[PDB]
Assembly symmetry: C6
Homo-oligomer: 150 residues x 6
Amino acid sequence: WRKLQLSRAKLKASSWTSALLSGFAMVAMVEVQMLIAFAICTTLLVAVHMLALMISTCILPNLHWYIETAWAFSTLLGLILFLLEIAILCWVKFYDLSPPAAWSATVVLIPVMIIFMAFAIHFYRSLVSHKYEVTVSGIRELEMLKEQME
Amino acid sequence: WRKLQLSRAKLKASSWTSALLSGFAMVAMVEVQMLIAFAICTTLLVAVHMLALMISTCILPNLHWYIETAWAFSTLLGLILFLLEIAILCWVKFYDLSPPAAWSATVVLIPVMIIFMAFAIHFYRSLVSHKYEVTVSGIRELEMLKEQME
Amino acid sequence: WRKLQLSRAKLKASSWTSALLSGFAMVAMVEVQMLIAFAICTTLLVAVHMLALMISTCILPNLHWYIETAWAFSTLLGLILFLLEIAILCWVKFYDLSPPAAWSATVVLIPVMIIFMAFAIHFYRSLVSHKYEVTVSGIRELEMLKEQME
Amino acid sequence: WRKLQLSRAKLKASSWTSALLSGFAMVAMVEVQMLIAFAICTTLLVAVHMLALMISTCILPNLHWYIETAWAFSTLLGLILFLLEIAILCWVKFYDLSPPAAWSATVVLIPVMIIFMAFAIHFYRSLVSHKYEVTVSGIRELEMLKEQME
Amino acid sequence: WRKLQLSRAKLKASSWTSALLSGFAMVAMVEVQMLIAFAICTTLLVAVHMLALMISTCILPNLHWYIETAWAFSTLLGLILFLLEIAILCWVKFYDLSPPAAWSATVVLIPVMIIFMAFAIHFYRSLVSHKYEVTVSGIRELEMLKEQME
Amino acid sequence: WRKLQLSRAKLKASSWTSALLSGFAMVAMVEVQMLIAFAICTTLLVAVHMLALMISTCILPNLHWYIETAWAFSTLLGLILFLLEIAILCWVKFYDLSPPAAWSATVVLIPVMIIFMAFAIHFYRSLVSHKYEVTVSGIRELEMLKEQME
């Protein structure tokens, strides 16, 4: 039951962020209307989220952990892309009369972006260690039973 | 019960994406205001989602798997259309002064679009094989009982 | 319990689409600002959805199937109206400099619109037959008991 | 338990429509920027919904049926006001160059508006009769027991 | 369990109204772009809602009734501020060419605003009396047992 | 079970505020289009919320309290940033013709901002004391059993 709720809640959240972020991001582009980055970033941002949405459709009928990786990976990319997207918007929006201020946007971006990616690595690292920790603990317990068995 | 939750959660998600995507997409068109593609893509995008929404209405009262195909198919089309829609927006929005950058939008589109459709095929293929796998496994188990039966 | 969830989920979805579609549709009209069709379509679209919303208010306290028809009918109309609405937007938005491309919008509309209404008829027809099928099966079973009864 | 779910679901729906409708309606006014009607209708529309939202706050802690009337009444008013609001928008939006088309908006409004209010009266009337029907049926059953009692 | 659902449902509703109202209100200000009131009202409106959102974060981990007062109070303020906000928008939006119509907005505001605040007082008053009523009823019942006790 | 619902509800709320606030805030910037503050505040606001969204993805699979701190901290920052963001918008929006009124926005900001941060400290302080209170009460009860034990 614990696993059932995990997927159910995640499904709603996935479409929640993907749909809204893609919509607002799309509107952001039409409203404003370096150049290549803005176009590519926007297209990729939408595409990545769309992939996640599809995952919501396939997961319902349903190796399971494999797709889980695709969803988390895709969802994560969208978040990074959205962050990159807003950074470009600040640079592009002010790019006309505000170029001086535009720089502060990307400059401040690096600090949070690095921590964003770095934080994920630290968490993943701890998770990896735990898997190994259980691996050693599991075999040991089994060995104890094996020794007393004889 | 497992099946009940699958439909319940899916129903909310369907209207979730269909309603939001259609709304934002519609707003994207009015804000900006090759030419034929933009008009057709927008109209089709909305129509496809509307079909899915109706499916949410008919599924409640309720062969069942058949309609399931219509919903997944329609929902999937909307996602592809939305991706195509944003690609057109980038080309159209910049189409005025930014035509040069506009190309990068569609060019980058192909890469993700191919993977989007290709990924679905791979998943479906594995699903098809599993169905056949169970088919062979099922008859075999039944035969074992039939042999011992005699 | 199966019936309880059906209404509960449907209630959220109804307000979901009706509220969002009406809001975005309304915004679509103010942003842009044949002529008569656009005004009437927009007004009707909003009115139909509003009716559905009210249905959500009356259903809670609660012949039951009768109102169900009103909700499904009203909700269905809104979907058709929204589709018609976007079609008009494409024609009206481009109606200024883009009239040539504007035609493709309504032309492509017919194909999907016909399938949209036609698909509903097919589903309803099957439902009607089932009702009659059960009618014959029900009386037959009762007759069997009546015969053996004597 | 049946009563618990009724309030829980209604609470989410109330804020759902009230919040969204008020937000979009508010945006509709700023975008466009007979005259008095538009200003009053918009203000009243928002105020009515706000009242409903507050009701959601007071109902949680919690005569109960009395407040229920306030919520339904307020929510209903908002729906009627929103319908009136969009009708004004069509008239006002086109009011500049499109006056000829603007008339069709309010004209078509009356038809649906009358049915909207009239339909509610019919449903309420049937509900009132049912209350009386049970009243007569209840006393009759009690009398039967009283007669046999002696 | 009854108390658990009360908080769970309220949490979703709080963020629901606070997030949407703040977002739309913020957009309303940028779109339009007496003067001091508009600036202060908008800032306060957002701030009050933000406070409520934070309350949603603190309540999860969790004297309990005390915070409940803060949430209801903050949420209530936002509703009043939003109502005041729209009133200012009508006056400001028309304030340029539409001054004649702008007045009707604030004038009609007073009527509903007074009833909005007055209605709350009446409800609170009844609640206060009930607390005292139980106080007298509780001691009396206890005294009856004390008398017979001797 | 009590803990399960706490995370489930919080997950939906997190994405709820983060997604909406980021979207509306992003749109607020494009619509309007001291200078440096606006650019940095907007970028940081989005980045902080994105971090929270990712947390929603990692929490599902899942030391637990540690991440809880990151989510609450990140979510809290976004709220403060959003408040700061709107304050800047009022100053920037009016910054053109309305500079005189622009000051009232930031001035009024301080009052609520201080109370916003101060209120959190008071609540946290009480929580800290409670932890210590239980610490003393816990050891005391255990000691009583230890004494009677001998």
